[model samples]
Target: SMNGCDGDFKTPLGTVETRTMTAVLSPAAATERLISAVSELKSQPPSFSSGVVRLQVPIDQQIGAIDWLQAQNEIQPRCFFSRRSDVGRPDLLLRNLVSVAGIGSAVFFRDLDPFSHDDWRSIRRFLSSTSPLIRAYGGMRFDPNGKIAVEWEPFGAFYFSVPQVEFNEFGGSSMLAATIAWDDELSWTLENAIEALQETMLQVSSVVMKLRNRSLGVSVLSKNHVPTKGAYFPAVEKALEMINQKSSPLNRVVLARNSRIITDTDIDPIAWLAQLQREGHDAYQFCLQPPGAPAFIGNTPERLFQRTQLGVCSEALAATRPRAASSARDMEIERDLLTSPKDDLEFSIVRENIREKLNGICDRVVVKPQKTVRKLARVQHLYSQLAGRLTKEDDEYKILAALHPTPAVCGLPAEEARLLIKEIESFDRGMYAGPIGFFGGEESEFAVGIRSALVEKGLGALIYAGTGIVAGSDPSSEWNELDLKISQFTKSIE
Candidate 1:
């Protein structure tokens, strides 16, 4: 049954048809056939609404959606977004190319000030016209001092999917999902729907073959690394120094540093991303490759915020400790993190900051009474969950503007902390602490871009990590905390 666009096909707001077809063939044959289908769909009348066709391949097949999209002809560069959820097994993927049905808009900002709320206003206005299936991803520099560069895309096209469970030979599988947005102005009959489905099937089957055909062999990687002494320690020292000065309003600041890893062979970002997905838990996994830029990939444990029709949700994830050697020891460390006055202060600042922001936009906000421990493979964090109902006529970006640069990422008293970060940090954050997530008309979720790396194909990778600095923070301790955050990325690649 057709379950996508919920309107009559004969009228405007036409019906959306989605289908899942099966294909069993070698990668080359599938690729040839899918290309042939794309040609066929290209010849069809542009009289139908946006739609998509998707395929469900076995998990063992080892094809990445972003990689496949890059391999395809006529596909736009930097038009790919992929996500893996630590809690849910489904990894959501999207490609904004190859469709006869679907319509949408996208925007890009390069080096905009972080405090300039104007871009958010313009983006919200642009998305306001499209359907709920909106997706935005990009880096917002940690300090507002530099130009910000980011891309935002909104589409109205036929949405398609192949559940990860489809390939799960086990009781359950963890395959990824896909979406397409199309223009609604187009018209279509059942015949058009049939051809569109065939077109989508061919395209997806081809992607499966391309992915299976490519070999992502790991090569011996070696590199010279600089110690954090020059860039990192100075930043930490400055932050600590400021917190002690009464004249400086900066009680906390997040300082980040980058480590360069040059490999003899090209780094396989997709393979690394897959490895991360397999190894990392309780985090949001993603790979974002924009045009002419290194691919940004990693798994982050921080969720900036999420909005839905029912209400809006945000996460207060702060206060990190290395995972102990043993479970017993881990619990002991967890207790220390939970009870430490310093850790408690850091976490409480984030929680209160979020509540105040939500209070402004939401009619009523509910914050969990206690924060919990979120354990990952290498680290653990003090976690708090916050939710609230929106007042009538409240927009998602309104909440985003209020909550972003939270005390968790930027520090308490956001403006003051941000300025201090700008003054102290030797490097630009690009998107390290910015929001990255998918949004539909009904709901959206964005994770803070932490525990992330910028991958340049032939060049080395620049890995970034940051830690919150408060009055109780010491230079040496903050330095170690930064190291813990960076290891999450380094361990995945190593």
Candidate 2:
């Protein structure tokens, strides 16, 4: 009762599969070999009850991960992550999305607090430090306590997964991989998991969607800003009032906006993501689109945290100013951003909050660069890096919980700010400004999901942006900042 090519029926599964099935095949040859390997895999009978199996093949030809992702039309859920502009790192373009041994988004944050210690332990069981490529990639909501937006229903409070297929681009080499996980105690059993894997593997595309540069001449039919511009004023004013209150412990409150644009023509999320790159530099680019859901994309310049080896780091990034039309004018604004007492105070609150959070989690924490400016293609911010030595590797869960919702995004005296943020804004944050990154076996990295948009190809995209409300913050200037942030997406699609 099996179906495989060439009549090879009894090849074992998960025992040196990648190596014994490995070789540098001529482009399409590797493609067919991959197909054949999975064909043989699909023929195997149920053996082990629980574990993970990963098979990979090397492609000698030059292929961009994004192109590979774009070509994967048969895969239901897709993703692209990494700072492409960084130039020297392994970036991932993943497809064939499925949960890992039931420890994916559905269960990772299900029936328990998000990012909790017990929750991470489940994902950790199926992970191996030796296999960095096999990891979960996704994000959570900015404020889980807030009401869910209708458009964000598919995403729920959070979503993450270990893709059954992943294309890794590093240096000059490309590795295409397929993975499967089974934990009878939690979700799938070996037989059922492989059956699903085989179905997904059949859809894995070898066709490279080569980078094609084209303009999206799509016009905006209309724009809907939740908490309409008129309402936004009052929200900001209220936030400022709370922050400036004498008895209130809230020093800063981050207010966000959602701008939904209806376009004349359907927009391709993948293409739109690439379009975002035209203005993307020194920023981490991420795209997380769940099955039957919209693509959540961003080119954020803030790192929520990066835990690797024994050291962990987070960014103290606050205070924003647009990159002027001219470099000379930009330098002028840079100086203004540096010396403006108001912006400086905002940046100081963000940096200090992060340092204090890290100090509680790590043995010792240090802030390098103390303070500086991080310039992106469209905007700039005051920035610094907070690195700390972890007491143990298992502290990852605690580290994530402590550092995230940092003052840079959520606000200070977290509890009070969270309550005010819930009351002030009119729309759900979804994953915007949330921690978006992957959990590598012994190491992990996450970037604040800012300067992001959620795209539903045919309908339109919901672009998101936020501004910090401090004692000296003005509603007019904060509103203008939202305009500046949304400009990046508008200018790209135009």
Candidate 3:
């Protein structure tokens, strides 16, 4: 049962054991307890790999219970938690924050860049968003008492660790990545997650803290983008302005997975909705689930974590691949993607952005000389999946932090791309381009939730779609690709 480290404690998500830790209590009598816990963590933030940090409460609690917890202690500002309920859920929308654990990912700090705290804070001001921007700095491992824990970012995709013989190695940690792709053997999966209620019901808070992981995903946008070049940016800016003025941008939070228990012959949720016309579900919401839909879950868009024993993989790819519609249509689209400089420029920005970000964190990164088509329900895209290794012993967080917001989603040369996006795009990506994955052990993955939308109850969610843009890209073809991308969601959205 040992996963290459000392004393791997078996739990549902994964396992871990370590020397130092603390305890987390539920809301009942635990309100006072949490106050004490936060007090201690703040006092000695750097002690436990930036110690005493407790992950946030689960989503359900935030919906009904967390306000009470917040009132009792000044925990609102200092405490951190994560969940996965809102990835693509249209209603009851949630935005999962992807930052750091040891201290916190520096994504929130105002001084950081064009990414400066000012930019994000401006975003925060614009949306008047109350959700905390998760950070990427913190402790190395979760404590035994259950009161304190951290999601080990780099360990979830594939569990490899610098299992040392020395300090603080016993307790477990997690890496982040997309859902675990069941190999060719597994046929079904049922998801059962533990929330604050479940943990309290189980009556073992520390054990609950012990079972968690982070996942990752990969996404590539086509060469053409519709709504015109950088069109969505202004909308985002306007929305941000509205958000700052009213602070009423939609409420989106993260939820966690308790179990991945798949069953045979289990009905597809979307299909059930499709067949239930008499039900009150809106006609717009009831669509046929995409056939041959990839059987994965947990806020995932596309799976990102892939590991080879030698830890060697390629990054850049050339020669745009084709989708399988009539060969003519496929070839036409492929030709457009290949010949369009706009698409090429967009694709290159993505390639260059990923490469530049990975410079210090990876060893032996390569993108092949040719491109490949990655097909979905309606369209195909050219891609350059990058692969590399933790160049140093603990560089997982460094790599994850660097690569995201790459031009593919945010834009190239991150800052300028983001600024342009802010100026043009009509909405905040929220969690759309952010990552969704699990963090456990040394292996993890994350998927780019491209071809996705934010959903919630009552109000139908808005799913934004876009294609990549380069100089020669045609506006109309780009719009067509956007429509094609939206088709994937339509399968789910009806």
lDDT by residue (tens digit), candidate 2, 1-494: 11011111132223211223465644456656766766676587436645566667776665666666766763545667774253432221102221111111211222212445555665565556776556767777887656887888877666666666777665565666666555454445666666676666666566776665768768889888887889988888777777777878788778888899998788777777766655577677788877778888887877888777678877788887788998799999999988888877778878888898889988778787677887766778898777888888888888888876888788887898888878877778888999888877766778899989998868899999988788888888888888888887877877
Q: What ranking emerges by TM-score with the best candidate at the front?
A: 2, 1, 3
The candidate with the higher lDDT, 1 or 3, is 1
Per-residue alpha-carbon lDDT of candidate 3 for residues 175-237, written as tens digits (9 for 90 to 100): 211011011111211111112212222321221122111211112112233243455344334
Task: Quickly count the clashes in candidate 3.
Answer: 134
Report how far residue 93 has shifted in candidate 3, in Å.
35
lDDT (0-100) at residue 452 of candidate 3?
42
Best by lDDT: 2
Q: Residue 184 lDDT in model 2?
A: 52
> After TM-score superposition, what is the CA distance of residue 468 in candidate 2 from its true location, in Å?
0.6
In terms of lDDT, model 3 sits at 0.30
Arranged by lDDT with the best first, the candidates are 2, 1, 3
Error of 1 at 19 (Å): 8.2
Winner of 1 and 2 under lDDT = 2
Candidate number with greatest TM-score: 2
